[PDB]
Design an enzyme around this catalytic site. Structure first.
Site, mmCIF file in Angstrom:
data_model
loop_
_atom_site.group_PDB
_atom_site.id
_atom_site.type_symbol
_atom_site.label_atom_id
_atom_site.label_comp_id
_atom_site.label_asym_id
_atom_site.label_seq_id
_atom_site.Cartn_x
_atom_site.Cartn_y
_atom_site.Cartn_z
ATOM 1 N N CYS A 59 0.809 -1.225 0.000
ATOM 2 C CA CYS A 59 0.000 0.000 0.000
ATOM 3 C C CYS A 59 0.841 1.274 0.000
ATOM 4 O O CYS A 59 1.548 1.560 0.961
ATOM 5 C CB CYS A 59 -0.989 0.021 1.180
ATOM 6 S SG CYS A 59 -1.915 1.584 1.283
ATOM 7 N N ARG A 67 -0.096 4.725 2.680
ATOM 8 C CA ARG A 67 -0.005 4.570 4.143
ATOM 9 C C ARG A 67 0.300 5.829 4.973
ATOM 10 O O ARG A 67 0.189 5.791 6.205
ATOM 11 C CB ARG A 67 0.989 3.449 4.504
ATOM 12 C CG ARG A 67 0.440 2.053 4.282
ATOM 13 C CD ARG A 67 1.463 1.018 4.664
ATOM 14 N NE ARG A 67 2.412 0.760 3.581
ATOM 15 C CZ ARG A 67 3.546 0.096 3.725
ATOM 16 N NH1 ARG A 67 3.891 -0.365 4.929
ATOM 17 N NH2 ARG A 67 4.338 -0.108 2.668
ATOM 18 N N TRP A 69 -9.304 6.166 -1.136
ATOM 19 C CA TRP A 69 -9.552 6.800 -2.426
ATOM 20 C C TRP A 69 -8.509 6.299 -3.434
ATOM 21 O O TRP A 69 -7.464 5.779 -3.042
ATOM 22 C CB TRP A 69 -9.530 8.333 -2.306
ATOM 23 C CG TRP A 69 -8.280 8.918 -1.678
ATOM 24 C CD1 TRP A 69 -7.071 9.152 -2.293
ATOM 25 C CD2 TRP A 69 -8.134 9.377 -0.330
ATOM 26 N NE1 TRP A 69 -6.190 9.713 -1.404
ATOM 27 C CE2 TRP A 69 -6.816 9.866 -0.193
ATOM 28 C CE3 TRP A 69 -8.997 9.423 0.782
ATOM 29 C CZ2 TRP A 69 -6.330 10.383 1.015
ATOM 30 C CZ3 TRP A 69 -8.517 9.942 1.981
ATOM 31 C CH2 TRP A 69 -7.198 10.421 2.085
ATOM 32 N N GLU A 93 -3.985 3.353 -11.176
ATOM 33 C CA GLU A 93 -4.670 2.067 -11.098
ATOM 34 C C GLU A 93 -5.819 2.018 -12.121
ATOM 35 O O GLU A 93 -5.939 1.052 -12.889
ATOM 36 C CB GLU A 93 -5.165 1.761 -9.685
ATOM 37 C CG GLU A 93 -5.930 0.451 -9.633
ATOM 38 C CD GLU A 93 -6.273 -0.050 -8.242
ATOM 39 O OE1 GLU A 93 -5.906 0.587 -7.229
ATOM 40 O OE2 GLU A 93 -6.943 -1.102 -8.184
HETATM 41 C C1 HEM Z 1 -6.514 6.567 1.508
HETATM 42 C C2 HEM Z 1 -6.088 6.391 0.250
HETATM 43 C C3 HEM Z 1 -5.377 5.093 -0.237
HETATM 44 C C4 HEM Z 1 -4.613 5.025 -1.332
HETATM 45 C C5 HEM Z 1 -4.274 6.201 -2.282
HETATM 46 C C6 HEM Z 1 -4.148 3.663 -1.483
HETATM 47 C C7 HEM Z 1 -3.324 3.184 -2.490
HETATM 48 C C8 HEM Z 1 -3.081 1.845 -2.763
HETATM 49 C C9 HEM Z 1 -2.579 1.280 -4.003
HETATM 50 C C10 HEM Z 1 -2.228 2.091 -5.271
HETATM 51 C C11 HEM Z 1 -2.483 -0.043 -3.842
HETATM 52 C C12 HEM Z 1 -2.040 -1.077 -4.885
HETATM 53 C C13 HEM Z 1 -3.387 -1.374 -5.552
HETATM 54 C C14 HEM Z 1 -3.342 -2.440 -6.615
HETATM 55 O O1 HEM Z 1 -2.592 -2.275 -7.607
HETATM 56 O O2 HEM Z 1 -4.087 -3.445 -6.471
HETATM 57 C C15 HEM Z 1 -2.926 -0.374 -2.504
HETATM 58 C C16 HEM Z 1 -2.980 -1.643 -1.957
HETATM 59 C C17 HEM Z 1 -3.424 -1.975 -0.698
HETATM 60 N N1 HEM Z 1 -3.964 -1.095 0.243
HETATM 61 FE FE1 HEM Z 1 -3.980 0.996 0.095
HETATM 62 N N2 HEM Z 1 -4.654 2.920 -0.434
HETATM 63 C C18 HEM Z 1 -5.434 3.761 0.350
HETATM 64 C C19 HEM Z 1 -6.134 3.362 1.478
HETATM 65 C C20 HEM Z 1 -6.103 2.121 2.099
HETATM 66 C C21 HEM Z 1 -6.879 1.697 3.253
HETATM 67 C C22 HEM Z 1 -7.935 2.578 3.957
HETATM 68 C C23 HEM Z 1 -6.517 0.433 3.556
HETATM 69 C C24 HEM Z 1 -7.047 -0.500 4.674
HETATM 70 C C25 HEM Z 1 -7.473 -0.016 5.850
HETATM 71 C C26 HEM Z 1 -5.511 0.019 2.599
HETATM 72 C C27 HEM Z 1 -4.880 -1.210 2.550
HETATM 73 C C28 HEM Z 1 -4.319 -1.784 1.424
HETATM 74 C C29 HEM Z 1 -4.003 -3.188 1.267
HETATM 75 C C30 HEM Z 1 -4.208 -4.360 2.267
HETATM 76 C C31 HEM Z 1 -3.413 -3.308 -0.136
HETATM 77 C C32 HEM Z 1 -2.958 -4.623 -0.805
HETATM 78 C C33 HEM Z 1 -4.240 -5.098 -1.503
HETATM 79 C C34 HEM Z 1 -4.102 -6.368 -2.312
HETATM 80 O O3 HEM Z 1 -3.258 -7.243 -1.980
HETATM 81 O O4 HEM Z 1 -4.865 -6.517 -3.311
HETATM 82 N N3 HEM Z 1 -5.291 1.064 1.737
HETATM 83 N N4 HEM Z 1 -3.285 0.806 -1.884
HETATM 84 C C1 LIG Z 2 -4.807 -12.574 -6.833
HETATM 85 C C2 LIG Z 2 -4.772 -11.284 -6.047
HETATM 86 C C3 LIG Z 2 -3.964 -11.159 -4.915
HETATM 87 C C4 LIG Z 2 -3.948 -9.956 -4.197
HETATM 88 N N1 LIG Z 2 -3.178 -9.798 -3.074
HETATM 89 N N2 LIG Z 2 -4.711 -8.930 -4.615
HETATM 90 C C5 LIG Z 2 -5.515 -9.027 -5.715
HETATM 91 C C6 LIG Z 2 -6.336 -7.826 -6.131
HETATM 92 C C7 LIG Z 2 -5.754 -7.253 -7.425
HETATM 93 C C8 LIG Z 2 -4.354 -6.659 -7.253
HETATM 94 N N3 LIG Z 2 -4.314 -5.609 -8.258
HETATM 95 C C9 LIG Z 2 -5.572 -5.449 -8.969
HETATM 96 C C10 LIG Z 2 -6.574 -6.135 -8.045
HETATM 97 O O1 LIG Z 2 -6.946 -5.206 -7.021
HETATM 98 C C11 LIG Z 2 -7.939 -4.267 -7.409
HETATM 99 C C12 LIG Z 2 -8.322 -3.475 -6.166
HETATM 100 N N4 LIG Z 2 -7.346 -2.459 -5.834
HETATM 101 C C13 LIG Z 2 -7.755 -1.374 -4.962
HETATM 102 C C14 LIG Z 2 -6.611 -0.975 -4.033
HETATM 103 C C15 LIG Z 2 -7.009 0.230 -3.212
HETATM 104 C C16 LIG Z 2 -6.706 1.508 -3.668
HETATM 105 C C17 LIG Z 2 -7.055 2.621 -2.917
HETATM 106 C C18 LIG Z 2 -7.724 2.467 -1.700
HETATM 107 C C19 LIG Z 2 -8.032 1.186 -1.240
HETATM 108 F F1 LIG Z 2 -8.683 1.034 -0.080
HETATM 109 C C20 LIG Z 2 -7.672 0.065 -1.993
HETATM 110 C C21 LIG Z 2 -5.566 -10.209 -6.454
#
Ligand code: HEM
Ligand SMILES: Cc1cc(N)nc(C[C@@H]2CNC[C@@H]2OCCNCCc2cccc(F)c2)c1
Ligand code: HEM
Ligand SMILES: Cc1cc(N)nc(C[C@@H]2CNC[C@@H]2OCCNCCc2cccc(F)c2)c1
Ligand SMILES: C[C@H](O)[C@H](O)[C@H]1CNc2nc(N)[nH]c(=O)c2N1
Ligand SMILES: C[C@H](O)[C@H](O)[C@H]1CNc2nc(N)[nH]c(=O)c2N1
Ligand SMILES: [Zn+2]
Lengths: 402, 404
Positions: free
Chosen positions: A106, A109, A278, A283
């Protein structure tokens, strides 16, 4: 023992001491690095619980106090009697923020301390899950002025099935497999779309049809619920200078709300705990719209721009991708919906690294996910070495429940 | 599947298992506790085992494994180590080993070309003057008036109690960096130290942004000697843009030949401390890293100003737009000058083909995702969606700290 961490743009060095707090192994060994893999494949509860309670009382500057000793006692008493325990609301709030803080992938953070936690552990049905989800969406969306939030549904229990949200996000668009083997809408969602229809949903036939939710209470078949359309804020995509762009009929939803991840706090597991912040614009602009296995709009846009699509060396893909990213940013800004571009987000993440270095002696980070999918080395994070490891509380991927 | 890493491509859904990683004889920096995959610098009995392994690899490659010729070579290597503390490679063993080191390099996206490497044997070299002659010959052959040919020149190996052959320059062709009175740098900030070292060893410096550095060449147990490359040997490309007519007026240029000169080539425990190699550029290295890194030529703002972009705000994507046009200028200019170059799209496409080739040939391919994915447009290329396993195989190229 303590890794040296260098920034190659500035020449500055830190040492990561936080990694010693990791109690959970990742996928790497000295023989091979698996850092690029997306999913690598009572007494123990008690020690995880104690460690978490210790983290909590240390955070409110009350380590060793009366309340600290007695809370540890309650936890031990509960686990010894029942094999499990329950968190107090304030502990849950602390735990949710820490799981975010700890999330290596993330980039957002810097915001970790600002999180609205909705306690939904008194939920006993899929209907009640829906109401909670509706309230989360309304709160989080806030007419475009997005607010970070998480709703926490009842924890897993040894006896029974999990509360689960079948959808990977609260808002996604359908993908309809066509007669000719092509897809209309989002190809990432063909399976869930088919599940919804099979569970009674009347489908649309558009490219941007908002999916219904399939919500699952313990040991029951999932139930289908349609999100009230007024609750789902969307942004029509236009471009600041290219007039024909608005005519592509493209759009995206305001609220990125992940609903498939497990939240682990103090050994307890919350299988349904949807969270939202947000968007970072790349993305949507890059992955969602330009991935070959997603909306794949790159060639369409490039042809509209009258670029030479016949050869790679005209860099038509690179040019079209930039304009699409620009359109996303302009459109969200125009509609007054919170968004962050990849330059701003990565600058704030570098600040976060510095804050954490001082606060905790390091910050777990997954370089491949932190570096944006366009213009990588144009952002400061590209030149920053990062150490990756698992800290708890933690968010954990769970595979589709079907 | 089996007890070997499962490797997925997320664009296509396809799966492989890496069995080649079992062949790794050397630890990287990762543990189960923490991944350090993103760090640039990872933190007689021995010789003979590395030698045996290499000779085994060579005889496997010519399909004579277990043969009398194979057993006799092993005995010859052991007897040589027994009496001298070292051994020497046969001509064809060196050729095989140098190709294998390239094949094994996890950070190289150009490996589809691995079998096509002209190996110059310079193990007879006995002075800094001769090193210079060999290097000039390499440059002439490799450059080939713009039709670039991959090559490596191998100087004598490290020896017990005797100094190393070393090229002090990190590449054969680099531009000078001149520290200014105001603290700014004229030219390439990456090269300030080597530039100052050249001045100390008698070089009369220039005062341009693109002055080709002389070579500092070190023969065993001697101070390095200074050698200026004749200008006719160093092919350069003036940069222009296909549509933006003012771009040429910026006076930017780059050299044709990317020739890495500071890496150690390790083969069967033998260490070749000077073995410069060269290929042709992938355009993003010049267009994005060399020209746009904040700590390099840093031209993004200059170019964005010329394009009339709003540089006062991040959300105009001014950096992205300027970087794309600079990258286009590099490709266009090299193509116009008829100098071999490959764009990031074509190069990553060819690397995916290479992965498939190696899956069939060896059961995997060690690859460093952070280096293979290009520095612009990462997810627009197929390698972004490909999981990769990283491990150290020998023969290998290893980084060497500067001799100063
Ligand atoms: C507030 C604005 C936030 C921004 C701009 C942001 C940004 C991002 C981005 C760009 C990613 C990679 C997304 C992807 O390519 O799938 C990500 C992943 C992640 N974010 Fe953040 N995030 C935000 C808020 C949060 C919040 C509120 C949480 C949880 C309380 C969080 C927890 C996570 C987690 C667990 C991942 C990994 C998700 C996965 O494995 O698919 N984020 N975030
Ligand atoms: C297979 C697998 C594993 C893993 N850890 N994760 C995934 C979700 C995929 C990762 N890449 C595209 C899709 O995730 C799409 C959702 N991404 C939103 C992230 C986000 C952004 C801003 C604020 C938030 F609260 C959350 C799939
Ligand atoms: C034929 C065309 C070639 C192309 C297009 C190519 C491409 C690349 C690129 C883009 C990089 C990353 C460079 C960086 O960002 O610093 C790289 C690294 C590397 N390449 Fe290749 N390469 C080619 C030929 C060769 C040859 C001939 C060899 C050796 C025989 C080689 C061995 C290596 C090694 C060892 C690295 C890592 C260098 C380091 O750690 O600094 N490559 N290559
Ligand atoms: C400290 C350190 C470690 C390391 N492994 N490497 C370095 C050279 C850096 C890497 N990144 C920029 C610079 O290397 C610049 C030289 N790269 C040319 C690569 C190339 C391209 C085509 C054909 C070839 F034969 C070679 C420094
Ligand atoms: C195979 C590779 O690890 C995979 O494509 C990753 C790379 N980096 C990413 N980075 C982010 N932020 N999100 C992603 O989905 C991915 N995908
Ligand atoms: C910190 C990070 O590992 C470092 O900046 C790397 C990232 N990927 C790279 N990839 C290539 N090809 N060349 C590089 O110099 C770098 N630098
Ligand atoms: Zn690793």
């Amino acid at each position: 023992k303590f890794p040296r961490v260098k920034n190659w743009e500035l020449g500055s060095i830190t040492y990561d001491t936080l990694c010693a707090q990791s109690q959970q192994d990742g996928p790497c060994t000295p023989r091979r690095c698996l850092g690029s893999l997306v999913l690598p494949r009572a007494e123990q509860l008690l020690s995880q619980a104690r460690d978490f309670i210790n983290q909590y009382y240390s955070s409110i500057k009350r380590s060793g106090s009366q309340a600290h000793e007695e809370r540890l006692q309650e936890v031990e008493a509960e686990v010894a009697s029942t094999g499990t325990y329950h968190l107090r609301e304030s502990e849950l709030v602390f735990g949710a923020k820490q799981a975010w803080r700890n999330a290596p992938r993330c980039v957002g953070r810097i915001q970790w301390g600002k999180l609205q936690v909705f306690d939904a552990r008194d939920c006993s049905s899929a209907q009640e899950m829906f109401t909670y989800i509706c309230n989360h969406i309304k709160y989080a969306t806030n007419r475009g002025n997005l607010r970070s939030a998480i709703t926490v549904f009842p924890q897993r229990a040894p006896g029974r099935g999990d509360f689960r949200i079948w959808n990977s996000q609260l808002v996604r668009y359908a993908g309809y497999r066509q007669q000719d083997g092509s897809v209309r809408g989002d190809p990432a969602n063909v399976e869930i779309t088919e599940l919804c229809i099979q569970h009674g949903w009347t489908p649309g036939n558009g490219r941007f049809d908002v999916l219904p939710l399939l919500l699952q209470a313990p040991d029951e078949a999932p139930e289908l619920f349609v999100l009230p359309p007024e609750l789902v804020l969307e942004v029509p995509l236009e471009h600041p200078t290219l007039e024909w762009f608005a005519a592509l009929g493209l759009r995206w939803y305001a609220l990125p709300a992940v609903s498939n991840m497990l939240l682990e706090i103090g050994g307890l597991e919350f299988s349904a705990a949807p969270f939202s912040g947000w968007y970072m614009s790349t993305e949507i602009g890059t992955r969602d719209l330009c991935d070959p296995h997603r909306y794949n709009i790159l060639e369409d846009v490039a042809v509209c721009m009258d670029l030479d699509t016949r050869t790679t060396s005209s860099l038509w893909k690179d040019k079209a991708a930039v304009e699409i990213n620009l359109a996303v940013l302009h459109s969200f800004q125009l509609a007054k919906v919170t968004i962050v571009d990849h330059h701003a987000a990565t600058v704030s993440f570098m600040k976060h690294l510095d804050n954490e270095q001082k606060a905790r002696g390091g910050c777990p980070a997954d370089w491949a996910w932190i570096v944006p999918p366009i213009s990588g080395s144009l952002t400061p994070v590209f030149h920053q070495e990062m150490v990756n490891y698992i800290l708890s509380p933690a968010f954990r991927y769970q595979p589709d429940p079907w």
